[PDB]
């Protein structure tokens, strides 16, 4: 559904490399019995059939307002013109399968035209693979 918090990201392409900085997120949805979550962020260039592009932040336990401050780099290839950078927050779970918290994505070609910087609204899993919603206001 919706109202999943927001995330602050920077994503820019420079000389065939995509640099992404995952800063922090605010107001995430509770996922655990204790009312909090143990969030981490998965980054991928999709489609990724062979599942080779995945990178992830560390897991921060017991918070709905994580501050990761982590950076990542992807080397781009020509075929990436048809790919998107997918950013998904998931809850790490000690005793159950990990579950989805919120997401968004950027087209590689679009980032090449204009870098991304700022706060973004977290979307549901399907929606997140298709667009993003900046919230500069
Ligand atoms: Pb959970
Ligand atoms: Pb958990």
Q: What approach was used to elucidate this structure?
A: X-ray
* Strand, coil or helix: 90: strand
Task: Compute the distance between CA of residue 133 and CA of residue 117 in angstroms, rounded to an integer.
Answer: 12
Distance 19 CA to ligand 1 centre (A): 29
Resolution of the entry in angstroms = 1.5
Of 93, 117, 94, nearest in space to 106 by CA: 117
Residues by chain with Cβ below 5 Å of ion ligand 2: 32, 38, 91, 93
Ligand having the closest approach to the CA of 39: 2
Domains of the chain are 1-137 (2.60.40.150)
Run of H or E residues at 100? strand 99-107
Look at residue 128 and give its three-state secondary structure.
helix
Q: By the 8 A CB rule, do 42 and 90 touch?
A: yes
Q: Report DSSP letters for 3-57, one per residue.
A: ---EEEEEEEEETTEEEEEEEEEESPPP-STTS---EEEEEEEE--TT----EEP
Binding residue ranges: 31-32, 38, 40, 90-93, 97, 99
Dihedral (Cα; 38, 95, 55, 90), 10-degree rounding: -50
Q: Residue 41 Cα, ligand 2 centroid: separation in angstroms?
A: 13
Nearest residue to 83 (alpha-carbon basis) of 105, 102, 103: 105
Q: How far is the CA of 90 from the centre of ligand 2 (A)?
A: 9
Question: What is the spatial distance between Cα 92 and Cα 61, in angstroms, rounded to a whole number?
Answer: 8
């Amino acid at each position: 559904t919706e109202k999943r918090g927001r995330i602050y990201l920077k994503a820019e392409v420079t000389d065939e490399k995509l640099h992404v900085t995952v800063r922090d997120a605010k107001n995430l949805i509770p996922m655990d019995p204790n009312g909090l979550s143990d969030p981490y962020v998965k980054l991928k260039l999709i489609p990724d059939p062979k599942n080779e592009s995945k990178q992830k932040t560390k897991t921060i336990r017991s918070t709905l307002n994580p501050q990761w401050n982590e950076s990542f780099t992807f080397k781009l290839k020509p075929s990436d013109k048809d790919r998107r950078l997918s950013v998904e927050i998931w809850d790490w779970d000690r005793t159950t399968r990990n579950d989805f918290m919120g997401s968004l994505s950027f087209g590689v070609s679009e980032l090449m035209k204009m870098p991304a910087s700022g706060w973004y609204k977290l979307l549901n899993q399907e929606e997140g693979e298709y667009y993003n919603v900046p919230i500069p206001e």
